[PDB]
Amino acid sequence: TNLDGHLLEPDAEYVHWLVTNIPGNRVTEGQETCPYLPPFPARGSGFHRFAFLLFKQDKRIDFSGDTRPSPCYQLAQRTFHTFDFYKKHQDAMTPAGLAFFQCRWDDSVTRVFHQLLDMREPVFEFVRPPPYHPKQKRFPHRQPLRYLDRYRDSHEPTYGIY
Amino acid sequence: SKNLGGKSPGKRFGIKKMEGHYVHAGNILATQRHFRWHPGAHVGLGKNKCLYALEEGVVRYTKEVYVPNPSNSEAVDLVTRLPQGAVLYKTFVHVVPAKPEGTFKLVAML
């Protein structure tokens, strides 16, 4: 599961590789519910977390609602909520393994966005809040000459009627 | 007659911002002659022992343990002379930041 990277919902996460009913250790023998998808973190917002969770179960769990198609390239279908997933499969599943890692943007995320997801690469930026300035006074007492530049809209001379 | 020079104005040494006041970066929190209030989180220390806010937030005043610098000889000596159960406490002034560091805005969907 990718905890950060969902463009629409903040409280939701992405699926990348879901494979259930693993006999013992043979992970390749178990049926893959969600095909593997490479990490695609945005260029601006970096350092997303990707977590492999391993659950041990008792019964042979069968489900048709959490199944994904073979392409599985739709971000609306690849929207997960581990809370609801564990609420659905709480009777048999119990989490026993965990391994999480950080991942940032590289030169393959543009390829993953264009070829696989059929999208345009979204680029973000870490903007900062604007600097605070007090209420501009009519007669700024003993203030430097640069007081009038803190409240300038643009550094371009504006000739009103001339 | 004999007593001269006793005329001098007050230096206005006091506490400017109280607990709960929303301050900005650079706002002087309190001025003092001797160390009465000690700076804590996001509170700087001028060379005149004045306290100013380094971030924009809410001012708070707490009582917290005092671990001095191992180079300040007087304070280290007082520390080592204290008994086995004594712990120095001081009044610290903090600024709890309210505004986040920044947001991630979409600039171009190429």
Partner: peptide
């Protein structure tokens, strides 16, 4: 348009290590 093209410009990164790693 493309159903996957929804961006919601206000991107929220709930990772507590994000800004620390970004310095």
């Amino acid at each position: 348009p493309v159903e996957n093209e929804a961006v919601a410009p206000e991107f929220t990164n709930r990772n507590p290590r994000n800004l620390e790693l970004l310095a």
